[PDB]
Ligand binder design. Structure first.
Ligand code: NA
Ligand code: NA
Ligand code: NA
Lengths: 107, 107, 108, 107, 107, 107
Protein backbone atom coordinates (compact mmCIF):
# COMPACT_ATOMS: atom_id res chain seq x y z
CA UNK A 1 0.00 0.00 0.00
CA UNK A 2 1.27 3.41 -1.07
CA UNK A 3 0.57 5.92 1.73
CA UNK A 4 -2.10 8.49 0.81
CA UNK A 5 -3.11 6.74 -2.44
CA UNK A 6 -6.61 6.20 -1.01
CA UNK A 7 -8.49 9.28 0.24
CA UNK A 8 -11.57 10.01 2.35
CA UNK A 9 -13.42 12.91 0.75
CA UNK A 10 -16.01 14.94 2.66
CA UNK A 11 -18.99 16.45 0.86
CA UNK A 12 -21.75 18.53 2.42
CA UNK A 13 -25.34 18.31 1.11
CA UNK A 14 -28.55 20.24 1.88
CA UNK A 15 -30.56 17.04 2.65
CA UNK A 16 -30.65 13.24 2.65
CA UNK A 17 -32.35 12.91 -0.78
CA UNK A 18 -29.60 14.83 -2.59
CA UNK A 19 -26.83 13.12 -0.68
CA UNK A 20 -28.21 9.65 -1.57
CA UNK A 21 -28.61 10.56 -5.25
CA UNK A 22 -25.00 11.80 -5.41
CA UNK A 23 -23.76 8.84 -3.36
CA UNK A 24 -25.49 6.29 -5.60
CA UNK A 25 -24.16 8.05 -8.71
CA UNK A 26 -20.49 8.23 -7.68
CA UNK A 27 -20.49 4.52 -6.80
CA UNK A 28 -22.38 3.52 -9.97
CA UNK A 29 -19.92 5.59 -12.04
CA UNK A 30 -16.97 3.86 -10.22
CA UNK A 31 -15.69 7.24 -8.85
CA UNK A 32 -15.85 5.89 -5.30
CA UNK A 33 -15.70 2.50 -3.57
CA UNK A 34 -18.33 3.51 -1.04
CA UNK A 35 -19.92 6.39 0.82
CA UNK A 36 -20.94 6.91 4.44
CA UNK A 37 -23.78 9.37 5.09
CA UNK A 38 -23.78 11.22 8.36
CA UNK A 39 -27.19 12.89 8.90
CA UNK A 40 -28.62 15.50 11.32
CA UNK A 41 -25.73 17.90 10.78
CA UNK A 42 -25.91 21.56 11.70
CA UNK A 43 -23.65 23.77 9.57
CA UNK A 44 -22.51 27.14 10.90
CA UNK A 45 -21.11 29.77 8.54
CA UNK A 46 -21.20 33.58 8.07
CA UNK A 47 -23.34 35.00 5.30
CA UNK A 48 -23.87 38.64 4.31
CA UNK A 49 -22.78 39.88 7.79
CA UNK A 50 -24.88 37.39 9.85
CA UNK A 51 -24.13 33.82 11.03
CA UNK A 52 -26.43 31.14 9.58
CA UNK A 53 -27.41 27.64 10.77
CA UNK A 54 -28.71 25.01 8.35
CA UNK A 55 -29.61 21.35 8.44
CA UNK A 56 -27.18 19.35 6.28
CA UNK A 57 -25.96 15.83 5.55
CA UNK A 58 -22.30 14.89 5.35
CA UNK A 59 -20.80 12.35 3.00
CA UNK A 60 -17.59 10.51 3.72
CA UNK A 61 -16.56 9.16 0.33
CA UNK A 62 -13.78 6.60 0.21
CA UNK A 63 -11.88 6.40 -3.13
CA UNK A 64 -8.49 6.40 -4.89
CA UNK A 65 -6.63 9.68 -4.49
CA UNK A 66 -6.03 9.78 -8.26
CA UNK A 67 -9.83 9.89 -8.74
CA UNK A 68 -10.46 12.89 -6.46
CA UNK A 69 -10.29 15.43 -9.31
CA UNK A 70 -12.80 13.36 -11.34
CA UNK A 71 -14.97 12.91 -8.24
CA UNK A 72 -14.92 16.65 -7.62
CA UNK A 73 -15.86 17.49 -11.23
CA UNK A 74 -18.81 15.15 -11.06
CA UNK A 75 -20.00 16.58 -7.75
CA UNK A 76 -19.73 20.10 -9.35
CA UNK A 77 -22.21 19.09 -12.05
CA UNK A 78 -25.35 17.95 -10.16
CA UNK A 79 -24.78 21.32 -8.35
CA UNK A 80 -25.83 20.78 -4.71
CA UNK A 81 -24.69 24.47 -4.24
CA UNK A 82 -22.91 27.07 -6.51
CA UNK A 83 -19.71 26.25 -4.60
CA UNK A 84 -19.70 22.63 -3.35
CA UNK A 85 -17.64 21.57 -0.30
CA UNK A 86 -15.34 18.77 -1.39
CA UNK A 87 -12.28 18.11 0.76
CA UNK A 88 -10.07 15.04 0.46
CA UNK A 89 -8.03 13.65 3.33
CA UNK A 90 -5.25 11.15 2.64
CA UNK A 91 -5.20 7.71 4.23
CA UNK A 92 -1.69 7.11 5.59
CA UNK A 93 -2.31 3.58 6.98
CA UNK A 94 -5.13 1.03 7.30
CA UNK A 95 -6.48 -2.48 6.60
CA UNK A 96 -4.56 -3.49 3.46
CA UNK A 97 -7.24 -5.85 2.10
CA UNK A 98 -9.83 -3.03 2.41
CA UNK A 99 -7.46 -0.48 0.91
CA UNK A 100 -6.78 -2.93 -1.96
CA UNK A 101 -10.56 -3.39 -2.35
CA UNK A 102 -11.12 0.39 -2.70
CA UNK A 103 -8.59 0.34 -5.57
CA UNK A 104 -9.96 -2.86 -7.18
CA UNK A 105 -13.58 -1.56 -7.42
CA UNK A 106 -12.52 1.87 -8.85
CA UNK A 107 -9.97 0.82 -11.54
CA UNK B 1 -4.00 25.39 -3.96
CA UNK B 2 -1.16 24.36 -1.63
CA UNK B 3 -1.74 20.82 -0.34
CA UNK B 4 -2.60 20.75 3.36
CA UNK B 5 -2.95 24.53 3.73
CA UNK B 6 -6.61 24.05 4.69
CA UNK B 7 -7.38 21.71 7.58
CA UNK B 8 -10.42 19.97 9.05
CA UNK B 9 -10.22 20.22 12.84
CA UNK B 10 -12.25 17.93 15.09
CA UNK B 11 -13.44 19.10 18.49
CA UNK B 12 -15.50 17.10 21.00
CA UNK B 13 -18.09 18.87 23.18
CA UNK B 14 -20.27 17.73 26.15
CA UNK B 15 -23.51 18.93 24.50
CA UNK B 16 -25.11 20.84 21.63
CA UNK B 17 -25.40 24.17 23.52
CA UNK B 18 -21.64 24.41 24.16
CA UNK B 19 -20.74 23.18 20.66
CA UNK B 20 -22.98 25.87 19.10
CA UNK B 21 -21.53 28.61 21.33
CA UNK B 22 -17.98 27.65 20.37
CA UNK B 23 -18.94 27.17 16.71
CA UNK B 24 -20.58 30.61 16.44
CA UNK B 25 -17.61 32.22 18.23
CA UNK B 26 -14.83 30.76 16.00
CA UNK B 27 -16.71 31.83 12.85
CA UNK B 28 -17.49 35.31 14.26
CA UNK B 29 -13.80 35.66 15.24
CA UNK B 30 -12.74 34.57 11.68
CA UNK B 31 -10.83 31.53 13.12
CA UNK B 32 -12.86 29.18 10.91
CA UNK B 33 -14.73 29.34 7.61
CA UNK B 34 -17.48 27.05 8.87
CA UNK B 35 -18.34 24.31 11.34
CA UNK B 36 -20.28 21.08 10.97
CA UNK B 37 -21.89 19.69 14.13
CA UNK B 38 -22.38 15.94 14.37
CA UNK B 39 -24.74 15.13 17.26
CA UNK B 40 -25.74 11.97 19.18
CA UNK B 41 -22.12 10.89 19.68
CA UNK B 42 -21.15 8.23 22.20
CA UNK B 43 -17.57 8.73 23.52
CA UNK B 44 -15.76 5.71 24.97
CA UNK B 45 -12.63 6.21 27.11
CA UNK B 46 -11.05 5.00 30.40
CA UNK B 47 -11.39 7.06 33.58
CA UNK B 48 -10.32 6.01 37.08
CA UNK B 49 -9.77 2.40 35.94
CA UNK B 50 -13.36 2.11 34.60
CA UNK B 51 -14.45 2.49 30.96
CA UNK B 52 -16.94 5.38 30.62
CA UNK B 53 -19.58 6.28 28.02
CA UNK B 54 -20.80 9.87 27.55
CA UNK B 55 -23.18 11.70 25.24
CA UNK B 56 -21.16 14.22 23.19
CA UNK B 57 -21.31 16.43 20.09
CA UNK B 58 -18.54 16.48 17.48
CA UNK B 59 -17.42 19.58 15.58
CA UNK B 60 -15.78 19.40 12.17
CA UNK B 61 -14.20 22.84 11.79
CA UNK B 62 -12.86 23.83 8.37
CA UNK B 63 -10.12 26.51 8.39
CA UNK B 64 -6.66 27.54 7.20
CA UNK B 65 -3.93 25.31 8.57
CA UNK B 66 -1.99 28.42 9.67
CA UNK B 67 -4.92 29.31 11.98
CA UNK B 68 -5.05 25.95 13.78
CA UNK B 69 -2.81 27.12 16.66
CA UNK B 70 -4.99 30.23 17.12
CA UNK B 71 -8.13 28.09 16.84
CA UNK B 72 -6.81 25.70 19.49
CA UNK B 73 -5.89 28.51 21.90
CA UNK B 74 -9.36 29.95 21.63
CA UNK B 75 -11.04 26.57 22.14
CA UNK B 76 -8.73 25.82 25.08
CA UNK B 77 -9.70 29.21 26.57
CA UNK B 78 -13.51 28.71 26.49
CA UNK B 79 -13.99 24.92 26.53
CA UNK B 80 -15.48 23.34 29.69
CA UNK B 81 -12.97 20.44 29.76
CA UNK B 82 -9.57 20.75 31.37
CA UNK B 83 -8.01 18.98 28.34
CA UNK B 84 -9.96 19.73 25.11
CA UNK B 85 -9.78 17.40 22.10
CA UNK B 86 -8.59 19.41 19.12
CA UNK B 87 -7.13 17.43 16.22
CA UNK B 88 -6.44 18.89 12.79
CA UNK B 89 -6.40 16.83 9.62
CA UNK B 90 -4.82 18.30 6.45
CA UNK B 91 -6.78 18.62 3.23
CA UNK B 92 -4.60 17.28 0.42
CA UNK B 93 -7.09 17.86 -2.48
CA UNK B 94 -10.55 19.36 -3.02
CA UNK B 95 -12.86 21.81 -4.76
CA UNK B 96 -10.52 24.75 -5.43
CA UNK B 97 -13.20 27.48 -5.31
CA UNK B 98 -14.33 26.17 -1.91
CA UNK B 99 -10.75 25.84 -0.67
CA UNK B 100 -10.14 29.40 -1.92
CA UNK B 101 -13.31 30.53 -0.10
CA UNK B 102 -12.09 29.02 3.22
CA UNK B 103 -8.95 31.16 2.87
CA UNK B 104 -10.86 34.28 1.70
CA UNK B 105 -13.19 34.38 4.72
CA UNK B 106 -10.39 33.73 7.30
CA UNK B 107 -7.70 36.22 6.08
CA UNK C 1 4.62 17.04 19.05
CA UNK C 2 5.76 15.14 15.98
CA UNK C 3 3.33 15.79 13.12
CA UNK C 4 1.24 12.75 12.19
CA UNK C 5 2.37 10.64 15.17
CA UNK C 6 -1.22 10.56 16.40
CA UNK C 7 -3.87 9.27 14.00
CA UNK C 8 -7.67 9.26 13.79
CA UNK C 9 -8.75 5.85 12.50
CA UNK C 10 -12.20 5.28 11.04
CA UNK C 11 -13.97 1.93 11.37
CA UNK C 12 -17.43 1.03 10.06
CA UNK C 13 -19.65 -1.38 12.03
CA UNK C 14 -23.02 -3.07 11.25
CA UNK C 15 -24.63 -1.83 14.51
CA UNK C 16 -24.19 -0.05 17.87
CA UNK C 17 -23.70 -3.25 19.88
CA UNK C 18 -20.68 -4.42 17.86
CA UNK C 19 -19.20 -0.93 17.68
CA UNK C 20 -19.39 -0.60 21.50
CA UNK C 21 -17.85 -4.04 22.05
CA UNK C 22 -14.92 -3.23 19.77
CA UNK C 23 -14.61 0.32 21.17
CA UNK C 24 -14.48 -0.95 24.78
CA UNK C 25 -11.96 -3.64 23.82
CA UNK C 26 -9.43 -1.37 22.01
CA UNK C 27 -9.44 1.08 24.94
CA UNK C 28 -9.14 -1.70 27.55
CA UNK C 29 -6.28 -3.24 25.52
CA UNK C 30 -4.55 0.24 25.35
CA UNK C 31 -4.69 0.19 21.51
CA UNK C 32 -6.56 3.53 21.52
CA UNK C 33 -6.89 6.52 23.81
CA UNK C 34 -10.58 6.95 23.04
CA UNK C 35 -13.31 6.29 20.51
CA UNK C 36 -16.16 8.40 19.22
CA UNK C 37 -19.20 6.57 17.89
CA UNK C 38 -21.23 8.22 15.15
CA UNK C 39 -24.61 6.44 14.78
CA UNK C 40 -27.43 6.45 12.18
CA UNK C 41 -25.04 6.08 9.25
CA UNK C 42 -26.23 5.00 5.81
CA UNK C 43 -23.51 3.15 3.84
CA UNK C 44 -23.76 3.11 0.04
CA UNK C 45 -21.69 0.62 -1.96
CA UNK C 46 -22.16 -1.95 -4.79
CA UNK C 47 -23.26 -5.46 -3.60
CA UNK C 48 -22.34 -7.46 -6.72
CA UNK C 49 -24.55 -5.83 -9.43
CA UNK C 50 -26.87 -3.93 -7.07
CA UNK C 51 -26.14 -0.68 -5.23
CA UNK C 52 -26.85 -1.45 -1.54
CA UNK C 53 -27.87 0.72 1.44
CA UNK C 54 -27.19 -0.44 5.03
CA UNK C 55 -27.56 1.01 8.50
CA UNK C 56 -24.12 1.31 10.08
CA UNK C 57 -22.20 2.92 12.93
CA UNK C 58 -18.95 4.79 12.44
CA UNK C 59 -16.05 4.75 14.90
CA UNK C 60 -13.48 7.54 15.07
CA UNK C 61 -10.61 5.99 17.01
CA UNK C 62 -7.86 8.30 18.31
CA UNK C 63 -4.47 6.63 18.90
CA UNK C 64 -0.70 6.67 18.29
CA UNK C 65 0.16 6.22 14.61
CA UNK C 66 2.66 3.50 15.61
CA UNK C 67 -0.26 1.47 17.03
CA UNK C 68 -2.41 1.54 13.86
CA UNK C 69 -1.09 -1.83 12.58
CA UNK C 70 -1.81 -3.43 15.98
CA UNK C 71 -5.21 -1.71 16.11
CA UNK C 72 -6.07 -3.01 12.64
CA UNK C 73 -5.01 -6.60 13.47
CA UNK C 74 -7.24 -6.60 16.52
CA UNK C 75 -10.19 -5.14 14.65
CA UNK C 76 -9.57 -7.52 11.78
CA UNK C 77 -9.78 -10.49 14.18
CA UNK C 78 -13.04 -9.64 16.04
CA UNK C 79 -14.87 -7.79 13.20
CA UNK C 80 -17.93 -9.46 11.62
CA UNK C 81 -17.24 -8.45 8.02
CA UNK C 82 -14.71 -10.52 6.12
CA UNK C 83 -13.00 -7.27 5.02
CA UNK C 84 -13.19 -4.55 7.73
CA UNK C 85 -12.93 -0.87 6.91
CA UNK C 86 -10.01 0.58 8.84
CA UNK C 87 -8.54 3.83 7.57
CA UNK C 88 -6.10 6.02 9.51
CA UNK C 89 -5.77 9.75 9.00
CA UNK C 90 -2.72 11.53 10.42
CA UNK C 91 -3.07 14.44 12.83
CA UNK C 92 -0.80 17.26 11.59
CA UNK C 93 -1.58 19.78 14.41
CA UNK C 94 -3.70 20.01 17.58
CA UNK C 95 -3.96 20.63 21.33
CA UNK C 96 -0.54 19.50 22.58
CA UNK C 97 -1.73 18.45 26.06
CA UNK C 98 -4.42 16.28 24.46
CA UNK C 99 -2.00 14.87 21.89
CA UNK C 100 0.42 14.11 24.76
CA UNK C 101 -2.45 12.44 26.65
CA UNK C 102 -3.24 10.13 23.69
CA UNK C 103 0.38 9.01 23.78
CA UNK C 104 0.51 8.74 27.61
CA UNK C 105 -2.50 6.38 27.86
CA UNK C 106 -1.33 4.11 24.99
CA UNK C 107 2.40 3.59 25.91
CA UNK C 108 3.33 0.03 27.13
CA UNK D 1 5.38 26.49 12.84
CA UNK D 2 2.82 24.94 10.53
CA UNK D 3 4.12 21.60 9.24
CA UNK D 4 4.94 21.65 5.53
CA UNK D 5 4.53 25.45 5.12
CA UNK D 6 8.21 25.74 4.20
CA UNK D 7 9.45 23.59 1.30
CA UNK D 8 12.77 22.53 -0.16
CA UNK D 9 12.54 22.68 -3.95
CA UNK D 10 15.01 20.86 -6.20
CA UNK D 11 15.95 22.26 -9.60
CA UNK D 12 18.35 20.75 -12.12
CA UNK D 13 20.53 22.98 -14.31
CA UNK D 14 22.89 22.28 -17.25
CA UNK D 15 25.83 24.15 -15.61
CA UNK D 16 27.04 26.39 -12.75
CA UNK D 17 26.59 29.71 -14.64
CA UNK D 18 22.87 29.15 -15.29
CA UNK D 19 22.25 27.77 -11.79
CA UNK D 20 23.86 30.87 -10.25
CA UNK D 21 21.87 33.26 -12.46
CA UNK D 22 18.62 31.55 -11.48
CA UNK D 23 19.66 31.31 -7.82
CA UNK D 24 20.53 35.01 -7.61
CA UNK D 25 17.29 35.94 -9.36
CA UNK D 26 14.88 33.97 -7.13
CA UNK D 27 16.52 35.40 -4.00
CA UNK D 28 16.56 39.01 -5.33
CA UNK D 29 12.90 38.57 -6.38
CA UNK D 30 12.08 37.28 -2.81
CA UNK D 31 10.78 33.94 -4.25
CA UNK D 32 13.25 32.04 -2.04
CA UNK D 33 15.08 32.57 1.26
CA UNK D 34 18.23 30.91 -0.02
CA UNK D 35 19.61 28.36 -2.42
CA UNK D 36 22.22 25.63 -2.06
CA UNK D 37 24.10 24.62 -5.24
CA UNK D 38 25.32 21.05 -5.49
CA UNK D 39 27.79 20.73 -8.39
CA UNK D 40 29.42 17.82 -10.28
CA UNK D 41 26.11 16.02 -10.78
CA UNK D 42 25.70 13.19 -13.30
CA UNK D 43 22.12 12.97 -14.59
CA UNK D 44 20.94 9.66 -16.07
CA UNK D 45 17.75 9.51 -18.15
CA UNK D 46 16.30 8.05 -21.37
CA UNK D 47 15.33 9.89 -24.53
CA UNK D 48 14.10 8.02 -27.60
CA UNK D 49 14.86 4.73 -25.75
CA UNK D 50 18.61 5.42 -25.33
CA UNK D 51 20.32 6.26 -22.04
CA UNK D 52 22.07 9.65 -21.67
CA UNK D 53 24.57 10.97 -19.11
CA UNK D 54 25.01 14.74 -18.64
CA UNK D 55 26.92 17.04 -16.32
CA UNK D 56 24.46 19.06 -14.26
CA UNK D 57 24.16 21.21 -11.18
CA UNK D 58 21.42 20.73 -8.59
CA UNK D 59 19.74 23.54 -6.68
CA UNK D 60 18.14 23.08 -3.30
CA UNK D 61 15.89 26.08 -2.92
CA UNK D 62 14.41 26.80 0.51
CA UNK D 63 11.16 28.85 0.48
CA UNK D 64 7.51 29.18 1.63
CA UNK D 65 5.35 26.42 0.28
CA UNK D 66 2.79 29.06 -0.82
CA UNK D 67 5.46 30.54 -3.14
CA UNK D 68 6.28 27.26 -4.90
CA UNK D 69 3.87 27.92 -7.81
CA UNK D 70 5.35 31.43 -8.27
CA UNK D 71 8.87 29.98 -7.98
CA UNK D 72 8.11 27.35 -10.59
CA UNK D 73 6.62 29.93 -13.04
CA UNK D 74 9.72 32.06 -12.78
CA UNK D 75 12.06 29.09 -13.26
CA UNK D 76 10.03 27.93 -16.31
CA UNK D 77 10.45 31.39 -17.79
CA UNK D 78 14.30 31.52 -17.59
CA UNK D 79 15.40 27.86 -17.77
CA UNK D 80 17.13 26.66 -21.03
CA UNK D 81 15.24 23.30 -20.90
CA UNK D 82 11.82 23.07 -22.48
CA UNK D 83 10.62 21.05 -19.44
CA UNK D 84 12.35 22.20 -16.21
CA UNK D 85 12.70 19.85 -13.21
CA UNK D 86 11.13 21.57 -10.23
CA UNK D 87 10.08 19.35 -7.33
CA UNK D 88 9.10 20.64 -3.90
CA UNK D 89 9.46 18.63 -0.70
CA UNK D 90 7.63 19.79 2.42
CA UNK D 91 9.47 20.49 5.65
CA UNK D 92 7.66 18.68 8.49
CA UNK D 93 9.95 19.80 11.35
CA UNK D 94 13.06 21.93 11.92
CA UNK D 95 14.78 24.85 13.63
CA UNK D 96 11.89 27.23 14.30
CA UNK D 97 13.95 30.47 14.19
CA UNK D 98 15.33 29.42 10.78
CA UNK D 99 11.86 28.37 9.53
CA UNK D 100 10.57 31.73 10.78
CA UNK D 101 13.44 33.44 8.95
CA UNK D 102 12.56 31.74 5.64
CA UNK D 103 9.07 33.18 6.00
CA UNK D 104 10.24 36.65 7.13
CA UNK D 105 12.53 37.22 4.11
CA UNK D 106 9.91 36.02 1.55
CA UNK D 107 6.76 37.86 2.80
CA UNK E 1 -1.17 16.25 -10.13
CA UNK E 2 -1.88 14.17 -7.04
CA UNK E 3 0.33 15.37 -4.19
CA UNK E 4 3.02 12.85 -3.22
CA UNK E 5 2.39 10.53 -6.20
CA UNK E 6 5.93 11.21 -7.45
CA UNK E 7 8.82 10.56 -5.02
CA UNK E 8 12.51 11.38 -4.83
CA UNK E 9 14.32 8.32 -3.51
CA UNK E 10 17.83 8.54 -2.08
CA UNK E 11 20.27 5.65 -2.39
CA UNK E 12 23.84 5.48 -1.06
CA UNK E 13 26.52 3.63 -3.04
CA UNK E 14 30.19 2.73 -2.28
CA UNK E 15 31.50 4.31 -5.50
CA UNK E 16 30.64 5.90 -8.88
CA UNK E 17 30.86 2.64 -10.91
CA UNK E 18 28.22 0.88 -8.83
CA UNK E 19 25.98 3.95 -8.67
CA UNK E 20 26.06 4.33 -12.48
CA UNK E 21 25.34 0.61 -13.03
CA UNK E 22 22.33 0.76 -10.71
CA UNK E 23 21.23 4.12 -12.16
CA UNK E 24 21.36 2.88 -15.75
CA UNK E 25 19.50 -0.32 -14.77
CA UNK E 26 16.54 1.33 -12.97
CA UNK E 27 15.99 3.72 -15.90
CA UNK E 28 16.34 0.93 -18.48
CA UNK E 29 13.90 -1.22 -16.47
CA UNK E 30 11.45 1.78 -16.31
CA UNK E 31 11.62 1.82 -12.46
CA UNK E 32 12.71 5.48 -12.51
CA UNK E 33 12.33 8.49 -14.82
CA UNK E 34 15.86 9.67 -14.06
CA UNK E 35 18.65 9.65 -11.53
CA UNK E 36 20.95 12.39 -10.24
CA UNK E 37 24.35 11.27 -8.94
CA UNK E 38 25.97 13.35 -6.22
CA UNK E 39 29.65 12.36 -5.83
CA UNK E 40 32.40 13.04 -3.27
CA UNK E 41 30.16 12.12 -0.32
CA UNK E 42 31.54 11.39 3.13
CA UNK E 43 29.34 9.02 5.14
CA UNK E 44 29.54 9.07 8.94
CA UNK E 45 28.10 6.17 10.95
CA UNK E 46 29.09 3.79 13.85
CA UNK E 47 30.79 0.46 13.06
CA UNK E 48 31.89 -2.16 15.63
CA UNK E 49 32.03 0.47 18.42
CA UNK E 50 34.05 3.11 16.47
CA UNK E 51 32.76 5.93 14.20
CA UNK E 52 33.65 5.28 10.53
CA UNK E 53 34.08 7.63 7.55
CA UNK E 54 33.67 6.31 3.98
CA UNK E 55 33.75 7.75 0.47
CA UNK E 56 30.30 7.27 -1.08
CA UNK E 57 28.10 8.44 -3.95
CA UNK E 58 24.49 9.50 -3.47
CA UNK E 59 21.66 8.84 -5.93
CA UNK E 60 18.56 10.98 -6.11
CA UNK E 61 16.09 8.84 -8.04
CA UNK E 62 12.88 10.49 -9.31
CA UNK E 63 9.98 8.09 -9.90
CA UNK E 64 6.31 7.28 -9.26
CA UNK E 65 5.56 6.69 -5.59
CA UNK E 66 3.70 3.47 -6.57
CA UNK E 67 6.99 2.13 -7.98
CA UNK E 68 9.09 2.73 -4.83
CA UNK E 69 8.54 -0.83 -3.50
CA UNK E 70 9.57 -2.30 -6.89
CA UNK E 71 12.52 0.13 -7.04
CA UNK E 72 13.62 -0.93 -3.56
CA UNK E 73 13.40 -4.66 -4.39
CA UNK E 74 15.56 -4.19 -7.44
CA UNK E 75 18.13 -2.12 -5.55
CA UNK E 76 18.20 -4.46 -2.53
CA UNK E 77 18.74 -7.41 -4.90
CA UNK E 78 21.64 -5.83 -6.87
CA UNK E 79 23.20 -3.58 -4.15
CA UNK E 80 26.62 -4.54 -2.62
CA UNK E 81 25.70 -3.69 0.98
CA UNK E 82 23.71 -6.28 2.97
CA UNK E 83 21.36 -3.47 4.05
CA UNK E 84 20.90 -0.83 1.32
CA UNK E 85 19.85 2.73 2.15
CA UNK E 86 16.68 3.47 0.21
CA UNK E 87 14.55 6.35 1.44
CA UNK E 88 11.70 7.92 -0.52
CA UNK E 89 10.54 11.48 -0.04
CA UNK E 90 7.17 12.52 -1.50
CA UNK E 91 6.87 15.46 -3.91
CA UNK E 92 4.02 17.68 -2.70
CA UNK E 93 4.25 20.31 -5.51
CA UNK E 94 6.25 20.97 -8.69
CA UNK E 95 6.39 21.61 -12.44
CA UNK E 96 3.29 19.73 -13.67
CA UNK E 97 4.69 18.92 -17.16
CA UNK E 98 7.80 17.41 -15.55
CA UNK E 99 5.73 15.54 -12.95
CA UNK E 100 3.53 14.27 -15.83
CA UNK E 101 6.70 13.25 -17.69
CA UNK E 102 7.98 11.19 -14.71
CA UNK E 103 4.69 9.26 -14.81
CA UNK E 104 4.60 8.95 -18.63
CA UNK E 105 8.07 7.33 -18.87
CA UNK E 106 7.44 4.88 -15.96
CA UNK E 107 3.94 3.54 -16.86
CA UNK F 1 6.96 0.77 9.04
CA UNK F 2 4.98 3.86 10.01
CA UNK F 3 5.11 6.43 7.20
CA UNK F 4 7.18 9.49 8.08
CA UNK F 5 8.53 8.04 11.35
CA UNK F 6 12.05 8.27 9.95
CA UNK F 7 13.22 11.66 8.66
CA UNK F 8 16.09 13.03 6.59
CA UNK F 9 17.27 16.27 8.14
CA UNK F 10 19.36 18.78 6.23
CA UNK F 11 21.92 20.97 7.99
CA UNK F 12 24.21 23.57 6.39
CA UNK F 13 27.74 24.14 7.73
CA UNK F 14 30.46 26.73 6.97
CA UNK F 15 33.11 24.03 6.24
CA UNK F 16 34.00 20.32 6.33
CA UNK F 17 35.71 20.48 9.76
CA UNK F 18 32.57 21.73 11.54
CA UNK F 19 30.30 19.42 9.60
CA UNK F 20 32.39 16.38 10.58
CA UNK F 21 32.50 17.45 14.23
CA UNK F 22 28.73 17.79 14.38
CA UNK F 23 28.18 14.62 12.34
CA UNK F 24 30.42 12.56 14.65
CA UNK F 25 28.73 14.00 17.73
CA UNK F 26 25.09 13.35 16.71
CA UNK F 27 25.94 9.74 15.84
CA UNK F 28 27.97 9.20 19.06
CA UNK F 29 25.10 10.74 21.05
CA UNK F 30 22.61 8.35 19.25
CA UNK F 31 20.62 11.35 17.84
CA UNK F 32 21.12 10.05 14.30
CA UNK F 33 21.72 6.69 12.62
CA UNK F 34 24.09 8.19 10.08
CA UNK F 35 25.06 11.35 8.22
CA UNK F 36 25.94 12.03 4.58
CA UNK F 37 28.19 15.02 3.90
CA UNK F 38 27.79 16.80 0.60
CA UNK F 39 30.76 19.14 0.04
CA UNK F 40 31.60 22.01 -2.38
CA UNK F 41 28.26 23.70 -1.90
CA UNK F 42 27.59 27.29 -2.90
CA UNK F 43 24.95 29.00 -0.74
CA UNK F 44 23.11 32.00 -2.15
CA UNK F 45 21.15 34.28 0.16
CA UNK F 46 20.61 37.98 0.98
CA UNK F 47 22.36 39.82 3.76
CA UNK F 48 22.03 43.58 4.46
CA UNK F 49 20.09 43.84 1.15
CA UNK F 50 23.12 42.42 -0.75
CA UNK F 51 23.31 38.91 -2.36
CA UNK F 52 26.09 36.77 -0.88
CA UNK F 53 27.78 33.57 -2.03
CA UNK F 54 29.55 31.29 0.47
CA UNK F 55 31.27 27.93 0.39
CA UNK F 56 29.37 25.49 2.60
CA UNK F 57 28.92 21.80 3.33
CA UNK F 58 25.55 20.11 3.54
CA UNK F 59 24.60 17.34 5.95
CA UNK F 60 21.90 14.81 5.22
CA UNK F 61 21.14 13.33 8.63
CA UNK F 62 18.98 10.20 8.80
CA UNK F 63 17.13 9.61 12.09
CA UNK F 64 13.81 8.92 13.87
CA UNK F 65 11.30 11.70 13.39
CA UNK F 66 10.65 11.71 17.16
CA UNK F 67 14.33 12.65 17.66
CA UNK F 68 14.31 15.69 15.34
CA UNK F 69 13.58 18.20 18.13
CA UNK F 70 16.45 16.75 20.22
CA UNK F 71 18.68 16.72 17.13
CA UNK F 72 17.86 20.37 16.46
CA UNK F 73 18.54 21.45 20.06
CA UNK F 74 21.94 19.79 19.93
CA UNK F 75 22.83 21.33 16.57
CA UNK F 76 21.69 24.78 17.55
CA UNK F 77 23.96 24.40 20.64
CA UNK F 78 27.18 23.32 18.82
CA UNK F 79 26.55 25.15 15.49
CA UNK F 80 28.59 28.31 14.79
CA UNK F 81 25.84 30.37 13.18
CA UNK F 82 23.36 32.27 15.30
CA UNK F 83 20.47 30.75 13.32
CA UNK F 84 21.26 27.19 12.11
CA UNK F 85 19.53 25.67 9.09
CA UNK F 86 17.83 22.46 10.22
CA UNK F 87 15.02 21.12 8.07
CA UNK F 88 13.54 17.64 8.39
CA UNK F 89 11.85 15.81 5.54
CA UNK F 90 9.71 12.76 6.30
CA UNK F 91 10.40 9.39 4.70
CA UNK F 92 7.11 8.01 3.37
CA UNK F 93 8.49 4.71 1.97
CA UNK F 94 11.80 2.80 1.77
CA UNK F 95 13.88 -0.32 2.48
CA UNK F 96 12.20 -1.67 5.62
CA UNK F 97 15.32 -3.39 7.06
CA UNK F 98 17.23 -0.10 6.71
CA UNK F 99 14.33 1.91 8.17
CA UNK F 100 14.23 -0.63 11.01
CA UNK F 101 17.99 -0.22 11.47
CA UNK F 102 17.74 3.61 11.78
CA UNK F 103 15.25 3.04 14.61
CA UNK F 104 17.32 0.23 16.25
CA UNK F 105 20.50 2.30 16.48
CA UNK F 106 18.72 5.43 17.87
CA UNK F 107 16.47 3.86 20.58
NA1 NA G 1 1.08 10.47 -0.46
NA1 NA H 1 23.56 14.54 -23.45
NA1 NA I 1 4.25 11.58 9.67
Amino acid sequence: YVPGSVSAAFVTCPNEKVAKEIARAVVEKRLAACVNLIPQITSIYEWKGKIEEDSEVLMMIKTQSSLVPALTDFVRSVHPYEVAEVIALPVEQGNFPYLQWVRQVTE
